[PDB]
């Protein structure tokens, strides 16, 4: 029970940090595509 | 003397009865996994858990 507790909270924090890190990756890719 | 000997014997008899009741509870598998919907939902949580 508490094992699945830290499991679920680590998945939620992991996806949250991914959602917050998508901006920089997309900005870098878009500026690389927009630059010849 | 017979008085406290009878309270002793009934007391250990109630102890044995509660022992048998606790045996039935421990060996009875009190968790039922919520029938059929809860067990497949829990299986979905383990397929999400081994997504790592």
């Amino acid at each position: 029970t508490e094992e699945l507790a830290e499991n679920i909270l680590k998945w939620r924090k992991q996806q949250n940090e991914v959602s917050s890190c998508i901006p920089k990756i997309l900005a870098e890719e878009s500026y690389l595509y927009k630059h010849d | 003397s017979y008085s406290q000997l009878l309270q002793v014997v009934m007391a250990v008899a109630d102890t044995s009865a509660k022992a048998v009741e606790t045996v039935k509870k421990q060996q009875g598998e009190q968790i039922c996994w919520g029938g059929s919907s809860s067990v497949m939902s829990l299986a979905t949580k383990m397929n999400e858990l081994m997504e790592k």
Side-chain angles (χ1 to χ4, degrees), chain B residues 1-15:
Chain B
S1 303
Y2 311 150
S3 74
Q4 292 83 18
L5 284 173
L6 296 174
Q7 288 93 22
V8 159
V9 297
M10 246 293 281
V12 66
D14 295 329
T15 303

Side-chain angles (χ1 to χ4, degrees), chain A residues 4 7 10-11, chain B residues 48-49 51-52:
Chain A
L4 63 86
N7 284 348
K10 70 97 177 178
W11 289 98
Chain B
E48 290 277 327
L49 188 153
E51 273 176 2
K52 78 170 77 60

